[model samples]
Target: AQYEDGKQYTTLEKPVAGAPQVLEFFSFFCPHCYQFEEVLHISDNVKKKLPEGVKMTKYHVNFMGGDLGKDLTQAWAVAMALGVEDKVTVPLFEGVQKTQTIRSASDIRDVFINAGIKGEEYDAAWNSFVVKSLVAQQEKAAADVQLRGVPAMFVNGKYQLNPQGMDTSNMDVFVQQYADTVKYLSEK
Candidate 1:
């Protein structure tokens, strides 16, 4: 708990009460986020290194792609609610950031469909109340934190880990520090 304020992490104004959880705020359209997902595999690797009883939660920020940001965020929440994120997350990143084929929610839907999720199920989840609420919550959370960049991660919804200033000379060091920081802040 003796971490420096502006070097390793930044404390949020209002700490959201969701202990034992590491929340990541990012955009599917962000190339860095894509690199973190595909090349470095930071998301799952960090999850693997997380301490017992702690888990990762991802929120798609609704600021990129103009109005399509909201649609993408909504699509992500829908994927989570429908238990299809494992099939959707990486493909969406690859589609948007890598191949640049995903232009709208419909394009994202195609990815979901290719992943075995039915179009009707996708539609139902897309229009579901819980998914809608989640999208709104993500939007509010992004705004609440004054989010200015993608791939932002928060531990217990308070400590924003600063990877730029940290020693990320190697992928393993970064993942280890991320898991360690997540565990450290989760105890707060």
Candidate 2:
């Protein structure tokens, strides 16, 4: 409630329902997003700090739609549909960027397999109508918002985090500001 309006974040026309939805719009091939993941400690820190009833979700952006990008997006969509996104998200990021190992959905599936989901299960989810629907939904949502870049955050689909307000020299401010904003919105 105390955060700056139109500067720190933008307000949506309609508020999202059922426990404020905190969505992070990112792509596997985005360097900025990858750096954000490491600097913000999304896997180890941010998730643990989320307020109760605040559901965090990732929207794999199709901003880059060539084969590699599309494949990674589908991989994320598959993981999300199977409810294994939390388990595979970080690994996918690392595998693609760090190890340079993930090139196709099959490569992504191997990561899922290492995380306990079998290859057949991943294949089924990867080809699922539900997964394709969700992926399409994500693309539409991104287009609806006229998203300009990756590593963007939205709270309850209402307030979007503004990068201009963030200070690169001090990463904690960005993280804490996001946390505070999400908590404030959730309480409303």
Candidate 3:
């Protein structure tokens, strides 16, 4: 189920058969967030190998969203609401990294349409319940972290590995290490 419904964290309708959990706090506009996206996709496979009961959630940080960081969070929430997150998300990642064009809600919607989702439905979803909740949730996260930039991450409620601390030589290595640390934290 969705993490935080617009009203609250709608936990697993039934608890995920695990104890501890890992959550990734990120933003789409961050360069590292783009690089980390690859690690996250790969981690889906790694996750399947983990012992049952461990779970992960990605909270898209929206301090930067829409055009000029206009906050298209409701649209983000809408995507989640309609269960079209990957449809909107994956493409946003690719488009942002691959080209220099401005990535706004319209730009993202075009990608969604290419993926076969009707543009109107996509717009409605962004304006719907989940997006409302997501916008609120993002505000809370931004405030909690006192964030000034994108791609800041928190592990088990703490900012452990970040651009300021870890080796920044290769983002792949950084993300893998970040994932490993969070996985270990879940077990501990």
Candidate 4:
């Protein structure tokens, strides 16, 4: 369905341009975020359906004030900056949500290790200036949207896909709605 302000999604007052952007704002600690991982699995299919110049990104929210949240956010920022987000994101989420093994910055090492990333490689990326800046940028991005919670999707940086008020309970519908919204906005 098309994004209808105050219905399927809310339109941002100030819209960003350049390329059509699809952003998912989430936190590792949220159960809904964990559930959303299943949706993330279908992202490759969704991307294939996206129009040219449309880019999809995930912004880890920093609203959770604690070591665990900070560490995971840092790890995610570093991984993305190093171009290894695809390798670490799923395992990182599983490590925290399923195994409960990841709790701090140090614990994230196991995630990389499992992903076959070298320890030194991760250390270098995690401590790099670029990663630091990316982390700060992600925090700012979330704040700019006034994001109040996890598991929210933004289309082209102009609309928020609010599933809370949606009529369906099926995740497939939600994901399809997100992809449809991205396609619609991308073409516009």
Candidate 5:
């Protein structure tokens, strides 16, 4: 198959059937992840060339930011529940990494509030079972994959991307390569 095992990727112990899932695991605190999300617009650009029927999913990791990391994951879930991932992604990233202003989930709520989400609605999603479930799912994904760091991607829950071997200098080139690698891995 010439899948470049151990360089481009390493196959995991488990694999998933049905449509390919290009699951991305990232942390808002990681500078590289911040670059991927905001500077490179990875999700928007990578999906543009993704193969047919393949779906890309994002999960915030719990490995970084310590106890605050869980709170940030909760924020991500709240954003998802409120349908404002696009709106608050940058805000949360910037606030946490750049300004170092957000320390608690309450601060996360302020970011959403700044994005036009009603405080009441944000509170409801924060405390809702769905959001808690989403947070738990992130933790589960991390454990299932035995994740070691930020900005990780797994295809079909098996093949993991090796960024060290990728041409990541240019966004356009990287996005194309990312799509191609994803397509190749998904078909395996």
Candidate 6:
């Protein structure tokens, strides 16, 4: 939601503390957000091509998947803090979507185990302050933003919606334009 200070507050306000050029509002249970997984990779490729110091991050909403959903998101930030994001990111997503191996909290742990991540590290990271803060922040943001769906895109702190929803036909171009516009705004 837009506060009096022209600030749009969301669940990631504390964890993702920066004036980033772009931010993506996503949900782990969202089929569209899942579909955007490829878009995210393409966008990352775009980031790699950009001038140094450019990055984009995602805020996962927990309104949909219920409790397990919230845990999944928190675990993501925790994995980031643990410095083994790839350990949980790819396989976990695959577990959630492809294998249907994750439908609960224990499922997430199973996914982590299958990914070869240490149990102690996973547990610690999952309960870390960074992950907890982001998770709490996302819930607050969801309440403030009055979110009703998943996979929303915010370009430079503003909400952006694709006219065509999740179709990938021109998704790459749209995301590139989004990044470019955000970059321009940030430079100013």
Q: Best candidate per TM-score, number?
A: 5
Model 4, CA-based lDDT: 0.75
- lDDT digits (tens) for residues 1-188 of candidate 4: 44566876778888655423777777777877777674444355558778776678887877774788888788888888778878887787787888888877778888897788888888988888888988997887787777888877777777877666555577667677766665765666
Lowest-lDDT window of 10 residues in candidate 5? 11-20
- Superposed model 1: Cα runs more than 4 Å off: 1-3, 17-20
Candidate 2 lDDT over residue span 1-188, tens digit each: 45677766778676554423777789877887787776676534556667665567778887664787888777878877888877887798898889988877678778999999987888888889988988897786676666878888777667777767655677777677666665665455
For each candidate, what TM-score against the reference?
0.88, 0.81, 0.69, 0.87, 0.90, 0.70
- What TM-score, to 2 decimals, does candidate 1 have? 0.88
Q: Per-residue lDDT of 104-124 in model 3, one digit per residue for the tens?
A: 657766777887888788877
lDDT of 5 at 98: 94
Q: How many residue pairs of model 6 clash at the backbone?
A: 2
Residue 99 error, candidate 1, Å: 1.4
Count of backbone clashes for each model?
0, 0, 5, 0, 0, 2
Q: Candidate 5 — what's its lDDT?
A: 0.82
lDDT of 6 by residue, 13-106 (tens): 4333333455566666777666666345544644654566656666666777788777877876776566666566666667777778787888
**Which model scores highest in lDDT?**
5
- Candidate that beats the other on TM-score, 4 or 6, i.e. the better one: 4
lDDT of 1 by residue, 9-37 (tens): 88888876643268788888887888778
Error of 3 at 3 (Å): 29
Error of 5 at 28 (Å): 0.9
Native-to-model Cα distance after best TM-score fit, residue 83 in candidate 3, in Å: 2.1
Q: List the residue pairs that clash in candidate 6.
A: 11-137, 11-138
The runs of at least 3 residues in candidate 5 whose Cα sits more than 4 Å from the true structure, single-residue gaps closed, are 1-3, 16-20, 169-171
Model with the higher TM-score, candidate 3 or 5: 5
**What's the candidate order when arranged by decreasing TM-score?**
5, 1, 4, 2, 6, 3
